[PDB]
């Protein structure tokens, strides 16, 4: 019971004390930490209503029952009179790095989540390090501290789709008065890059600032785990050498994928080349149907792009399909072209890239449609979207004994656990999780807190809210309807639907009837919100405070007693009535 | 009980139907009503976990205990084979006319809320009138069906406020790639309300082809209550008559008011001729500091204006100050001139409005500070917006007898209700309700929905969501900071705030800590989410999602436990930590 879990804290913990708020012996040992800087978690036993339980309970360990206790490392090491005698005799600091490891945490990966996950543990006193390498693409794109999202992921993107916006700030600033001439203006793309690259480079170091503040020991290399608690790395001078750690954290995230065929990699970039490249792709092949790839196909047309996407199968697979092909059919009629149903089978090259002028080559793309026909059609740029995927064989020796799945990823219970016991994984590595980045960062607080600081509180991976930014954007809360018929079957489903149109579309003579939402609620239990979508300006912001209400489980009554504010668009869903079953059409 | 209910419903329903979806014998008296065209509510007995008491309890009034039975206004009409015998007979439809009035239902006031309770009486079978005249203002300014909202309120001052944010879209246009020079465009009045005109045109006329479908008749006439049941209308052509209704809604809103000075009402407008207005206002006063005030302020300096606000006492009376003061450093700091402190005493004239050449006069404004000094400067318009008030001696005859209150608005029960039993209002003639557009709408729906078709919901009109579209879009729900400790005490309130900033605002060089957001929790009640507050881009879709879990009640750790979105703003709700409390400071 209360019985085992202080076991485990007193075991993990690299410093900590017992105390009461209501103390001056408490607070007259804290003091005596805070001048000597050495940094501990706390546990006000006045605080918890477990506290009596266990201030006898500690004794299992001091043979004492009074406040304070300090323990370093498992190990008890005094009462106030014996710290400040450890003190005075200028003994303490010698006691506080006694560790049977190097660090007491090391974070294999310095993205997100790992990130994340050791700042917030030496907050609590554990010696931390961190390390992080960035394999060169094939063409050599690297890039500095913080992972995916920071560099080659949402951070990059989501500026650049801003910039897409902005070709239609310009359009309607006309009907509004302004007296610009949207049909002469032109987008430059180097000068686009050079600041997206500026925000990048000041998030890189405000990160290298962050860990040395905290007292975090930063390793740019190349780290692999040989023994449970040996890690081995490697420089830039290829330097190798052994540190060890009480606890390590695997947090490497993953890479983007390649097809399997003639001139891929040769000829083709991905994601991670596009955000600092140094020319205008051009006319340009999307291959892939992922978010990822919709997303980029997106703002490369709103940027005056000649843009395709080639699509093997179905658009987003996993969303919403009714989202799915709303969300496409306004990227067709708004430019971006689709060949449906086509898969690539080789690229051979006809110009180099001519790195002097800032300038592409030019492709010959070779595909069939599944009907048959053939595909054949030429690009300026050919950019792959097919999937990403961790590779742990380069990080994590199939001898220590940590259970992968099929995937590729790692399995883990619901506190983030390796197979052996000092180990954990977070990120998306995880397996079956949900692939975000403020999922990771959710993962690597919580996690470190229970490690070094006595924490019980879990991650709730379920109904995690979503937001594709495509020129139309689309946010997302719980289950897909197709999803929510399949589990409790079509009679106990009702859905509630509507059209509308933002206040601002008005005068700048938008469309009548693209935005879409809807409400997937369940019949026999309360008409219980499933799930929420929505399409149309500003998803996400629309949806991140209903992901509150649903996670307390919300009903569609909550929604009808609730007020909107108006005029916005967020208001709709307060006020809907007309359902999928009735029949009645959902337009204005 | 059950009992006193139904007595109820069948008074007031023009014509109702008790039935079972299981039954042929409902479905063949349904058929005849669809085909005569006889609109009539329905209640589905066999659907109230109450069905079994009411279907014996009815007899009181049929003395009968079968499905189908059929009322028109209080009286019982007959089983299945007497409707159809009055059908095949040809004399159905005369006695669904029978009433002792000539409307079941005359709704004096076609705005907001007006129309709402109009439209969704006639759904279920009630003979609805409804009335709107639009009392020219001092100049004579004067617009269409739909009210305050739809025409001198939340729809022509938004897309006014859109077209002042496409001002920070050009600038932010040129760091994103973009050729354009923002500092060689200008923006043209005249041609932003022309299309702010044509948009509330076709509202106006939307709401008059609504009414017709829906069988109500609309009378462009002022009305009058003169005894409970008489309601007297003059149109036009000055012409005088009675009509005569079972129930009378009162739903007129309210008109600007003016300073008691020299000069206000002559050489002075309010905020119902600013948005028709035929020319640019030029150097304006704006006395007032209302939100309507900050707001119109707001739009007309980011329209290249000259602007100046002069305060009696504080910004946003009511609403949190710490905002407040935000909200108004945001303006300064853009441009609008603030009077601090300070109050008109006359306005005198020193050009007539020029209206062959669309150009303003010019005035002389007199005024003095509240320390002593003197205030003294020429402006070519002055806008007066100092405070909303109904006019009911209007409209009301003292003499039937509805209590007003001191204020000059209507005192109702929780059910809208007035001091006369046939009679209710709504909007913004209800006393200490809050006076938004949705409310209103909010309020005649739900009405409606219980004198015509036994509907017991009422309107909930606690925890109402605002938004200020100032400059920076200030977003609240809940009580703010100030009235949380005055109601519990400032030990039992703690407060979570965050500075912030948009990614967009990265790349544009926009201001580090101007974005705010803050949880004003209490303590003692599992730490409830007493208000909620931000200070950004966007607020109204920000806000509105939150206003459902407050609504449920929510807590910090549901916040705590959901997840964020990224990159958004919203997101920052999720991941709070510093208290006010701390001392921590709240920067990025
Ligand atoms: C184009 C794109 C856009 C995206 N947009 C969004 C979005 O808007 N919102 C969202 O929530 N998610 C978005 N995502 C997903 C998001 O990036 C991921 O959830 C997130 O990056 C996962 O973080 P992580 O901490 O698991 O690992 P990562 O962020 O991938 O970081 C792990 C780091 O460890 C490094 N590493 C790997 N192996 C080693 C080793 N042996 N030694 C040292 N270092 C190593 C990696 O190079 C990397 O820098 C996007 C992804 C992409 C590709
Ligand atoms: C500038 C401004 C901006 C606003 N912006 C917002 C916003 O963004 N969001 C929001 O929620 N609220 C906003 N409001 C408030 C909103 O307009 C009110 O809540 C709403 O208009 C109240 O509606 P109502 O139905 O009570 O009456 P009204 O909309 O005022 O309609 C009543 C109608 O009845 C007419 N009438 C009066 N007497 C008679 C008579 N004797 N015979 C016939 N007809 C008569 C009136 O002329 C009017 O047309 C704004 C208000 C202003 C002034
Ligand atoms: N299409 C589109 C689109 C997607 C998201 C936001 C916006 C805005 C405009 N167009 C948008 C024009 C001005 C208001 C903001
Ligand atoms: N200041 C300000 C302001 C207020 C509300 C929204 C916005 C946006 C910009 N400025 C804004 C620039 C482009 C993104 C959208």
Redesign the interface.
Known sequence: GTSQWLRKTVDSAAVILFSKTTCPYCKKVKDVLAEAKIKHATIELDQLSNGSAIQKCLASFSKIETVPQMFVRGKFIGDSQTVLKYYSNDELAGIVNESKYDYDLIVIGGGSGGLAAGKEAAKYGAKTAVLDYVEPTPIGTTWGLGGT?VNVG??PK??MH??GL??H??E??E??????DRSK????????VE??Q??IGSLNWGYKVALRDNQVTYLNAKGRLISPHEVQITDKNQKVSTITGNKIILATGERPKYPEIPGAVEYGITSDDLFSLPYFPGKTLVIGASYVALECAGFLAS?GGDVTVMVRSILLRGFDQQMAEKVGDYMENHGVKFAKLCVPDEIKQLKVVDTENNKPGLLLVKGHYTDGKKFEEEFETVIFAVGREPQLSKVLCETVGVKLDKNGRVVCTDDEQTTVSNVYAIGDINAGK?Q????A??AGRYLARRLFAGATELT?YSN????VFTPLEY?ACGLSEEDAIEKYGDKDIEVYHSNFKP??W??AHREDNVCYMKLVCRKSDNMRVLGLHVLGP?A??????????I??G?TKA??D???????????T???LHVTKKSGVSPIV
């Open positions: 999202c949402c951070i989501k500026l801003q910039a902005l070709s700030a310009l309607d600033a009907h509004f008065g302004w007296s610009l203006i032109s987008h430059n793309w180097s000068t686009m600041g997206v500026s925000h940027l949900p975000l980045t403020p999922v960062i959710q709730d995690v809210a979503t937001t946010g206040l601002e008005t005068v500003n996400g912001e629309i949806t991140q405070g209903y992901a509150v209400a996670k307390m919300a909550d929604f007693r609730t007020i909107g504010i108006h005029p916005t668009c967020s208001e869903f307060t006020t």
